[PDB]
């Protein structure tokens, strides 16, 4: 049993709800929150700027720090660091930004990052500001992902639209 609360359950490891991924980490304190991170751990804007936001910043000082010491990430990548306020820990993934021309295909080696940790609160990776088409983030997930993983989706429309197509 887990604290995950209003979750409409997709797959045997793959649940999801319409939430802020931001207010869901302030209740719940996941052990892992994914963000929806780039290379460079520049927190501006889309999922990555709003938990930074809710961090006060200390994501990015962190961030910071993290990248003048090992370089950016790769595509496909990730990083652990503090979940701050947030949660124990956050997994910075770099799913492809469709808006950049990465490649697609990366997506499936993003989500396999998930499979490090037997529990998660995610957002769909390559989904919102990252152009990708977020049904197929999901279909993508669920294929990949077979540790726990609890999926907030901001948009009620697009949750709509994910559990009604959802085969
Ligand atoms: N909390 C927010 O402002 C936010 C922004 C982009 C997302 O994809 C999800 C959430």
């Given at each position: 049993?887990?604290?995950?609360?209003?979750?409409?359950?997709?797959?045997?490891?793959v649940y999801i709800?319409?939430?802020?991924?931001?207010?869901?980490?302030?209740?719940?304190?996941?052990?892992?929150?994914?963000?929806?991170?780039?290379?460079?751990?520049?927190?501006?804007?889309?999922?990555?700027?709003?938990?930074?936001?809710?961090?006060?910043?200390?994501?990015?000082?962190?961030?910071?720090?993290?990248?003048?010491?090992?370089?950016?990430?790769?595509?496909?990548?990730?990083?652990?660091?503090?979940?701050?306020?947030?949660?124990?820990?956050?997994?910075?993934?770099?799913?492809?930004?469709?808006?950049?021309?990465?490649?697609?295909?990366?997506?499936?080696?993003?989500?396999?990052?998930?499979?490090?940790?037997?529990?998660?609160?995610a957002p769909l990776?390559?989904?919102?500001?990252?152009?990708?088409?977020?049904?197929?983030?999901?279909?993508?997930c669920?294929?990949?992902?077979?540790?726990?993983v609890y999926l907030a989706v901001?948009?009620?429309?697009?949750?709509?639209?994910?559990?009604?197509?959802?085969?």
């Amino acid at each position: 049993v887990n604290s995950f609360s209003g979750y409409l359950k997709l797959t045997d490891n793959v649940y999801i709800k319409n939430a802020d991924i931001v207010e869901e980490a302030k209740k719940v304190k996941p052990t892992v929150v994914v963000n929806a991170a780039n290379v460079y751990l520049k927190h501006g804007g889309g999922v990555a700027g709003a938990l930074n936001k809710a961090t006060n910043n200390a994501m990015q000082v962190e961030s910071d720090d993290y990248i003048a010491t090992n370089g950016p990430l790769k595509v496909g990548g990730s990083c652990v660091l503090s979940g701050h306020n947030l949660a124990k820990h956050c997994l910075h993934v770099v799913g492809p930004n469709v808006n950049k021309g990465e490649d697609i295909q990366l997506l499936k080696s993003a989500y396999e990052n998930f499979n490090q940790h037997e529990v998660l609160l995610a957002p769909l990776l390559s989904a919102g500001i990252f152009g990708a088409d977020p049904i197929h983030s999901l279909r993508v997930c669920v294929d990949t992902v077979r540790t726990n993983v609890y999926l907030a989706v901001f948009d009620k429309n697009l949750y709509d639209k994910l559990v009604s197509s959802f085969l």
